[PDB]
Nucleic acid binder design. Structure first.
Ligand SMILES: [Mn+2]
Lengths: 343, 100, 218, 346, 343, 98, 342
DNA sequence: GGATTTTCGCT
DNA sequence: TTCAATCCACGCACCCATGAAGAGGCGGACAGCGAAAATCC
DNA sequence: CGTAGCTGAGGACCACCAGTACTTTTTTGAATTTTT
DNA sequence: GTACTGGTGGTCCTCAGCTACGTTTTTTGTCGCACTCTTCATGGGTGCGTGGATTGAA
C-alpha cells in the first residue's frame, strides 16, 4: 500500500480510515486491520465507498497532506486540502514547459523510446514463447529495424521528426501485428484499421480497451495535480486531454494488446457477442461487455513487479504510480522520465 | 377582498391516540362543507374572505393542538393559470358553464 | 304596563348610534345584516368567552356574566356581559347571597381603544341600568380590551349622563317616524359591514332629474 | 372594486332526467337510483335549474330558501311550471311603502315614466349602434328616421301623467321598433326570418330562442327582487292580473332589449347555431336539441361574465349583476335617498 | 290523512307521497295506505320528511295548487308555487285593513270576546269541579263581572276603549289566577307579570309556553300567506310578528295556562330544575326544558272535537285551522271572524 | 425565480405493481424539495428545474391509474403559507443555524 | 446572474453528513435530524468534528458547491476542492500575465486604488452623518491625504513601490479606527485594530469575519476557474493567504469592518457573550455566534444597485461579479479591471 | 531509366 | 363670483416569449509519413 | 457506504352498515399602524 | 329523509429490516471555422389605481 513513493493506496473496499494518536488505522468491519505512521507521508489516495474519521481529516489538513477520494475502480470523486500546496507551482511549470518546444520534444522522444522498447521486447518474448509455427527470422529482422529506430529516436531533436517516425512505426506495427495471435487466427482478424468507428471485431475491442485505459489515465493525472487538456507531444486543443493521449500512447503496449490476445486466445470470448450495423460497427453484447469488465478487474488484481522501483504491486496501480513519477519530474527531483528504459 | 380565491387546505389528524376517529370524522365533515376533495387528505375550495375566516377559526377550534397539523395555502385571484393537472383524477370547476 | 316595557330598544343599537348613524338605522329599522371578517372575530370571542349557568365563588370577588338588565328611565333592555361584586362596607347587599358588596360593570370589546366616543357611551348606560335595579352608587367602570389584553378604567360624570339621556331620547324618537337619516360618509366608513346595502356613493351625488334629462338631449 | 356590491355566484343547470337533488350538510348531491353523479358546495351557487322529472327533498328546499338560493323547475321548454319561494322577512318598511305607493296611481305613473323612458332609450341607442357599424347593408336611412322618431317620442313620454296614456305610447314605440327588428338576418339564411309572434307554441325559429332567453331572464329578475327585500308580485304598472310576477316584468322591461334579444341576434349572426339542430314533431311547434341546449347555455353563462362600467353609480361591475344593482337602486329610492329611480341607460 | 276545508294535512311522519292517475297516494315503505281525489283541493300541507313526488309536484303546480312543506314540529321549510303563489289579493287586503280604525277594532273585538268567554267558562268549570278548596264566592263574582264585560266589549268602536277593557279583564283573571294551583305552593306562587327578565320560578315557565305557542301560530299564518309582521290590534314595529300576538290571544289561556297548571298539579316536575340569578331572575335547566318540550309534544297528540265545525281532530291542528278561517275571512264568504269559542 | 411550489401525489399501490411505483415516486419527489406531510411536498425551485422535475416525474408514474397535482404560489409566499398544528417545517430562507 | 444561494451551518458536535439522491441528511448515531435538498445550496460549513460521505464530497465538488470545515473560532481547515473543468485558454492567459511585472503592477494599482477609495469615502461618510460625536476636522484631514496617495498610486509602474505605500494606508487609517466606536467603549476592550492572532478581546469578531470572507471569495473565484490567493499581485510568500481576499481587499475593509462596527454601535452584542481561557485566549459564546450568523445572512440578503449598469443586484454577488469581470478583462474585451468603488 | 508525381492508409 | 364633483386620459408597475452571447464539439481543407506503384522519360 | 430490489408491520383515509333522535328564548357583534 | 354515534374492512404511505451489489465510459494529426447546446437578458401586452380639466350650482 504505502509505496516508497510517499502516497497511500488503500484499495480494499470497506476499509475505514481513522485516527489513533498520530497514526492512521485501517478498520476492516470494526477490528484493527492495519496501522501506519504519518510522519513521512505526503498524500493519501483512497479507493472505495468508505469514509474518513473527521479526526483524521483534521489531522491531515493542517500538516500539508491532501486527502483524495475516488471510487473503487476510478473516477476522481473529490479532494480535501486547506491552503492548497503542491498544485499551483506544478501546474504553472506544466504550462511553461507546454509553451516551449525543446523540452516538449525531449519528453516526447522519451515516451516514444519507451514505446518502441516495449513493443520490441514483446515481440522477442512472443517469438521465444512459441518457436514452433512462427516466422522467427522475420521477427528478428523487425527487431533489428526497431532497434535502429530506437537509437534514432534517442538521437532526435525536433517535433516534426517525432510525429513522422511515429506514423512510420505505426504502419509497420499494424503490418507485422496481423501475424501474432495464435488461437482462433481464422476467426475475424484485421487487414484495416480505423481511428474512427471501427471495422473488424479486434479493432473495436482495442477501441474499448483504449477507452478504459483512457478513463484510468485521466483519473491518474487528476489525482496528483497536473492538468488534462494541454499535452507535450500532442498539441493543445479545447476538449481533448492531450497529456492523457500522450500517456496512453506510452502505455499502449503490455497493458492493452496482451489483454486483447489473452481474451481472443484461451477461447474465453466467442463470436456470438459481436454484431454489425451497416458500417462495420461491432456492437458489444451486454453479456460480452459484462465478461469483459470482469476479466479487466481480474487482470487488474494480478500481481507484477515495477521495472524501475522494483516493488511488487497490482496492475491497477501501474498507471497512477507511473504518472506520479511524472510529477516528481516536474518538481525538479528527476532528470528524465523513464517509463520502461535502461539508462 | 371579494376576490373569490381558490384556497387549499391540508389536514393531518392522528388516530393512534384517544383523539382518533371522532376528530378525523369531525374535521372531514367540517372541511368538506366549503369545498370538494381532489385527493385523499387534501382539499381545494373557492372561497371569499369571510367564509375562509370562519372556516379557519372553526378548524383551529376543533382539532387538538400539539398533536395535529393544518396548512392553508392562498393562491390568489388569477388561479386558473396556476393549477396544473397530470393524472386521471378529474375535478369539477365551478367558474365554468357547469351543465349536468 | 308590559307594552311600555315592550317598547324597549337594544343597547347595542345605542352603541351604534354614536357612529355612522345609519348602521343603527339600517340594523334596527330595515332589519338587514351582513358579516365582515372583524364581525366574525367579535362574534366568536363573544360566544366563546360567555357561558351562563356558571359562577365563581372565589371569595376575593364575584364575577357573573350574561346578566339581563332593563332600565326604565331610558327604556333600554340589554344583557350586561361582566358584573363584578367586590367586598365593601358601604355597598348594598345582593339578592340571594349573604353579605354586602359593591358592583362594577365591565363590557369587553375587540380592537384598539377608540379615540372618540362609541364604547364609553355604552358603558355609561350599563351603570344606569344597575342604578335602576340595585339602586346604589356606580361611579367606576372597567373596559377589557382584547387586542392589547388589558383593562382601562373610566370615571363616570353627570355630563356623560345628560349626553346619553338626550341621545337615548332622540334614538327612541326615530321609531315614531321610521326615517333613516344620512350623514357625511368620510373615509372611515369603509370597513362597514352594511356597505353592500349602505351605498355611500348614493348619498352625496347629483340628483337623477339632471342626469336623466342630460343624456336625453341627444 | 370599490362598492363591491355582490359577486355573481354561479348557477347549476341539470338536464339529465330522473335525478334527485339531495342535501348532505351544506352540499347538494345529485343521486339517481342510489348512484352518485356529483356534489357541489352550496355556498358557491345562486340558482339551481331543473329539467324534466327532478325531485327535491324537503330539507334541501328548506335550506335553499333561507339563504336566497333559488330553485326552479322546467319541463322541456322553460315553462313556469314551478319555483320555490321561502318565508317572509321582517322588513315591513319597504313592503308597506311599496303597497301604499301601488295604491296611488300618480306614483304609479311617476315610476312607469322612468321604466318606459329607459326602455325607449335602450331601443334607440342600440339601433344607432347597429347602423353605424354596418354601412353596406340595409337602408341606412330608414334606421336613421326611426332614430329621430324615437328621440322625439322619448321627451314626450317623459312628460306623461296617467297610466293609460303611458300604455298607449309604450305600444306605439313597441310596434315602431318591431318594424325594424324584423330586419336583422345579416349572416344567416331565411330560416331565421322573423314573421311575428306566437305565444304558446314556438312554431318557428327565433321564437324558440327568444322564449328561452326571456324565461332565463325573468327567473333572474325575480330572484334579485326577492333577495333585496321587496315583494315581487305587486307592480307599479301592467293590469294587476292576479298571481303573476308583475314587478319582475316591470323591471325586465328595461334589460330585455339590451340583455336578451341582443344576445340572440349576436348568437345568430355569429353562426354559433345551425338550423339542423332544431326539429319538429307531428305538430310539435319547434323543440331545441340537447347539444343545441348545451351550446345556448354555454354561450349564455360565458357572456354573463363581461365587465362594464355602470352609468350612474360609476363602478366597474360584471354584466350579470346589472339586474341586481338596478333593483337595489330601486328599493332605496323608496327611502328617499335619491330624487327618482335612474333606469339603466346603456 | 285528514281533509279540513279543502286542505290536506299529513301529520304522521315518514310517509312518502306520490301521484297515481289523477289522485294523491300516501305510502309507507311500499305499502298502500291512502288514496285521495285531487278534484277539489286548494292546498297541500306536509309534516314529514316525505319529499312528495315530482309527477305530483308538476301536476299540482299546473292545476293551481301550491305545496307547503313544514317539519313534523310545525316549523316552516319551503313553499313550492308556480306563477300564482295564491296570496296576493289576501295580503293586499290585510295591508289595506291594517291602516283603518274601524275594521281593526272589529277584529280586535272578535279576538277579545273569545278570550273573555274562554276565561269565564274555565273559571266556572273549575268552580264546579272542586268544592272544598275553593272560595266559590270570589269566582262567581268575577264570573258575573266578566260576563258583563264581554257584553260591553261586544259594543266597542274605539281602540283606546278596547285596550282599557282588555287591561281590566287581564287584571281580573290575574287576581283570580293564583289560587288555581292546588299543589306545591311552597315556591310556585303567582303574584304578578314580569315578561322581561322573569322572576321567581313559575313566571318564567309561563313565558316559555307563550313563546312556543307564538312560534307555532307564526308558522300557521305562513301556511296561508298572511304577512306575519303587520298586526291588527297590536301596532306594527320591525322585528316583531304583531299579527301572531294579535291572534294568539284567544288560544293563550286554554292552551298554555291549562298545560302549565296540569304540569304543576300532576307533579310532572319540581322546582329543583330552576337555577338562580343574582337580581332575582329565573332560568330553566336543560333537563327540565327537554321534559317540558316532550310533555308539550305528547299533549299535542290529544284528540278533541272542533266547536265550530265538529270534526274530531288533534290539538296540534287548532292553531292552523283557526288561522285558515282567518284567511277565509279576508277574502271569502265568512260574515265575521270566528273565534275559538270552546266550552 | 425562487418559486415555492407544492406537489401532491396519489399513486395506486395495489393494482398490479404499485409498490415499486410508489417507492420510486417518493424518492424522486424527495430529491427535489422538502418533506412537509404525508403525500404533500413543497419545493423551492426555478422554472427550468421545475420543468425538468415535471418531465422526470411524468414518466415514473403510470397515467390512467394515479393522480399528481402541482400548485405554484409566487415570490412572496411568506404572506400565503400559514400553519396551526404541530408538524414544524424549516423555511429555506432562515439563518439556518444547527 | 446566480441569485445568491443559501448556506448551511452545523455546530453541534459529532454529527454526520450523508447523501441520499440529491438530499443532504444529518445523522448522529442513526437519528435523522433533517434533510435539505442540494439544488438550492451554495456552500456548507461545519464546526467541531463532523464527517462527510465521500459520495457527498464528490457530488458537491462536481456541481459547484463548496464544503468548508471550521473549528471553534473559525480556524480554517480542510477546504473541499474539485478538479479542472476546462476553459484552458483562460488559464493560459492568467498564467502568462503573472511573472511579468507590468501587468502585475497594473492589477496591483487597481486593487489598492479600490481599497483606498473605499476606506477614504467610508470615513467621510461616517463623519457626514453625525458630526457631534467626533472631530470632523481631523477626519477631513485624513481624507485629503488619502486622496493625495490616490494620485501617486495611479502614477505607478513597479510592484515593489506599492507595498511601501501599503504601509502608509496601513498606518494612516489605524489612528482613526479606535475612534470609530460610539457606544459601549469602556466595556468592549477597544485598543483599535491593534491585533493579536492568539486573541486579546474584540478581535475574535475580526478574525471570524476575515475567515468568513476568505471562504466566500475563494468559492466565487473557483466557480469561474482560477486561483488567486497567492497569484500575480500578492507576494510569493507561502502562508500569506490574502490575495484571494485582496480581490476583496476592496471589500475586506468594507464588508467586514463595517459589519463589526454596525453590530457594536447598534448595541446588539453584550459583553457577557465572550469569555477568556486560563492562558489568555478569547472565545465567543454559542448564542452570540448564532446571533452573528443570523445577522450576517440577513445583511447579505439586502439588495442594492451596482455602479456599472445599475441592474438591481444583491450583496452576496459582490465577490462573484468581481471574479466574472476579471475573466472578461483577461479575454481582452476591456482595457483594465474596473474595481468596486463605494 | 529516373526524378517525380500521384496514389494511398497510418500520426 | 367662485366653485365642487366627473370623467377622462394618463402614467406606472411588472410580466413574458424570444433572440442573441460563451463554452463546446463537427466535420472539411491542408500537414504529414514513407513507401510503392507506377507515372512517365 | 450509497443504490437498487424485495418483504414486513404498522399508522392514516375513506366507504359503508346499523341503531336511537328530530321545535329554545333574547340580544349580542368590527371601522385611517390596509383592506383589494 | 338527515344528523350523530358506534364498528368493520379495504386501501394508501413511511419506516424497519434483509440481500446483493459499487460505475459502465464504441477517436483523438493542426487550423481557424461555420454549427449546436445551454443560459441570461429585453420590446411587445396587461392591467389598475390615480390626479387634471369641466362646468352647474351656491
Ligand atoms: Mn361584549
Amino acid at each position: 500500500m504505502k509505496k516508497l513513493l510517499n502516497t497511500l493506496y488503500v484499495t480494499q473496499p470497506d476499509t475505514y480510515l481513522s485516527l489513533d494518536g498520530d497514526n492512521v488505522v485501517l478498520l476492516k468491519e470494526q477490528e484493527k486491520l492495519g496501522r501506519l505512521p504519518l510522519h513521512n507521508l505526503e498524500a493519501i489516495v483512497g479507493f472505495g465507498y468508505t469514509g474518513a474519521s473527521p479526526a483524521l481529516m483534521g489531522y491531515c489538513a493542517e500538516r500539508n497532506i491532501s486527502i483524495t477520494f475516488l471510487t473503487k475502480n476510478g473516477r476522481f470523486l473529490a479532494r480535501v486540502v486547506g491552503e492548497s500546496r503542491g498544485n499551483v507551482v506544478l501546474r504553472k511549470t506544466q504550462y511553461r514547459i507546454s509553451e516551449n518546444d525543446q523540452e516538449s520534444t525531449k519528453i516526447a522522444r522519451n515516451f516514444i523510446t519507451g514505446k518502441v522498447y516495449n513493443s520490441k521486447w514483446m515481440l522477442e518474448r512472443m517469438t521465444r514463447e512459441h518457436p514452433l509455427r512462427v516466422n522467427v527470422e522475420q521477427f528478428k529482422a523487425t527487431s533489428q529495424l526497431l532497434s535502429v529506430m530506437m537509437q534514432e529516436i534517442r538521437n532526435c531533436d525536433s517535433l516534426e521528426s517525432l510525429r513522422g517516425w511515429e506514423g512510420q512505426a505505426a504502419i509497420n506495427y499494424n503490418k507485422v501485428f496481423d501475424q501474432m495471435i495464435l488461437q482462433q487466427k481464422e476467426e475475424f482478424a484485421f487487414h484495416g484499421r480505423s481511428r474512427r468507428p471501427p471495422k473488424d471485431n479486434v479493432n473495436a475491442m482495442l477501441s474499448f480497451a483504449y477507452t478504459l485505459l483512457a478513463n484510468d489515465v485521466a483519473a491518474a493525472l487528476e489525482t496528483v495535480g497536473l492538468d488534462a487538456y494541454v499535452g507535450f507531444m500532442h498539441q493543445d486543443r479545447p476538449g481533448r486531454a492531450s497529456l492523457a493521449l500522450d500517456l496512453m500512447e506510452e502505455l499502449r503496449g503490455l497493458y492493452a494488446d496482451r489483454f486483447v490476445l489473452s481474451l481472443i486466445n484461451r477461447k474465453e470470448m466467442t463470436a456470438d457477442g459481436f454484431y454489425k450495423k451497416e458500417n462495420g460497427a461491432v456492437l458489444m453484447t451486454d453479456e460480452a461487455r459484462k465478461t469483459f469488465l470482469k476479466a479487466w478487474q481480474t487482470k487488474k488484481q494480478e500481481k507484477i513487479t515495477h521495472p524501475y522501483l522494483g516493488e511488487k504491486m497490482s496492475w491497477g496501480l501501474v498507471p497512477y504510480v507511473q504518472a506520479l513519477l511524472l510529477a516528481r519530474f516536474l518538481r525538479g527531483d528527476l532528470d528524465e522520465y523513464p517509463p520502461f528504459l535502461w539508462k | 377582498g371579494a376576490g373569490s380565491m381558490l384556497v387549499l387546505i391540508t389536514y393531518d389528524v392522528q388516530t393512534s391516540s384517544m383523539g382518533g376517529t371522532k376528530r378525523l370524522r369531525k374535521v372531514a365533515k367540517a372541511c368538506q362543507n366549503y369545498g370538494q376533495r381532489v385527493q385523499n387528505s387534501v382539499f381545494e375550495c373557492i372561497v371569499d374572505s369571510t367564509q375562509l375566516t370562519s372556516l379557519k377559526l372553526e378548524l383551529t377550534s376543533l382539532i387538538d393542538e400539539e398533536k395535529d397539523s393544518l396548512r392553508i395555502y392562498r393562491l390568489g385571484n388569477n388561479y386558473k393559470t396556476k393549477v396544473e393537472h397530470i393524472g386521471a383524477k378529474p375535478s369539477i370547476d365551478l367558474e365554468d358553464p357547469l351543465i349536468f | 304596563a308590559s307594552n311600555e316595557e315592550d317598547r324597549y330598544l337594544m343597547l347595542s343599537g345605542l352603541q351604534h348610534f354614536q357612529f355612522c348613524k345609519r348602521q343603527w338605522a339600517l340594523i334596527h329599522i330595515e332589519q338587514q345584516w351582513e358579516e365582515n371578517v372583524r364581525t366574525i372575530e367579535g362574534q366568536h370571542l363573544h360566544k366563546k368567552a360567555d357561558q351562563p349557568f356558571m359562577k365563581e365563588k372565589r371569595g376575593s370577588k364575584l364575577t357573573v356574566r350574561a346578566m339581563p338588565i332593563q332600565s326604565k328611565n331610558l327604556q333600554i333592555s340589554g344583557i350586561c356581559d361582566v358584573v363584578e361584586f367586590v367586598q365593601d362596607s358601604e355597598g348594598i347587599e345582593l339578592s340571594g347571597v349573604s353579605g354586602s358588596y359593591k358592583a362594577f360593570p365591565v363590557e369587553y370589546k375587540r380592537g384598539k381603544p377608540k379615540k372618540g366616543d362609541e364604547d364609553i357611551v355604552q358603558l355609561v348606560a350599563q351603570a344606569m341600568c344597575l342604578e335602576e335595579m340595585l339602586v346604589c352608587r356606580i361611579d367606576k367602570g372597567y373596559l377589557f380590551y382584547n387586542e392589547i389584553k388589558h383593562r382601562v378604567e373610566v370615571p363616570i360624570t353627570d355630563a356623560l349622563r345628560d349626553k346619553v339621556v338626550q341621545m337615548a331620547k332622540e334614538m327612541h324618537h326615530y321609531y315614531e317616524n321610521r326615517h333613516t337619516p344620512k350623514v357625511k360618509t368620510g373615509p372611515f366608513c369603509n370597513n362597514c359591514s352594511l356597505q353592500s346595502i349602505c351605498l355611500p356613493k348614493l348619498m352625496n351625488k347629483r340628483s337623477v332629474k339632471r342626469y336623466i334629462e342630460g343624456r336625453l338631449s341627444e
